[PDB]
Design a protein around this ligand. Structure first.
Ligand SMILES: O=C(O)c1cc(F)ccc1NS(=O)(=O)c1ccc2c(c1)CCCC2
Length: 89
C-alpha cells in the first residue's frame, strides 16, 4: 500500500566525530538542522523536519529535549555504528 514513510539509517562513524544535527521539540523530537562535517550530512538521507523515533536502543517518543540531547551525546561519544529510525511524514 501507500508508504508509512518510516526509514532506518545506519551510519558508520569510523570517519566522523559527530552526527552534526540539532534537535527541536519534546509532538516529538525533530531534526532542527544538519551541520556540514557530520555523518548525517555526508549520508544525505535525514532532513530537517524528520521526526526521531529511535536511535540505537532508545525510543525518542514523548522524550524531553534535555534527555534527547544528553542521550545522543552518549550514543555519539561511544564508538560503533549509529542506527536512526525517522518518520518522514
Ligand atoms: O553528534 C551530534 O550531532 C549531536 C547532536 C545532538 F543533538 C546531541 C549530541 C550530539 N553529539 S555531541 O558530540 O554531544 C555534539 C553536541 C553539539 C553539537 C554537535 C555535537 C555537532 C554539531 C554542533 C553542535
Amino acid at each position: 500500500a501507500m508508504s508509512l514513510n518510516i526509514i532506518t539509517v545506519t551510519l558508520n562513524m569510523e570517519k566522523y566525530n559527530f552526527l552534526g544535527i540539532s534537535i527541536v521539540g519534546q509532538g516529538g523530537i525533530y531534526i532542527g538542522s544538519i551541520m556540514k562535517g557530520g555523518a548525517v550530512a555526508a549520508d544525505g538521507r535525514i532532513e530537517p523536519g524528520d521526526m526521531l523515533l529511535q536511535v540505537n536502543e532508545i525510543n525518542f517518543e514523548n522524550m524531553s529535549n534535555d534527555d534527547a540531547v544528553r542521550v545522543l551525546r552518549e550514543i555519539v561519544h561511544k564508538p560503533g555504528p549509529i542506527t536512526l529510525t525517522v518518520a518522514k511524514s
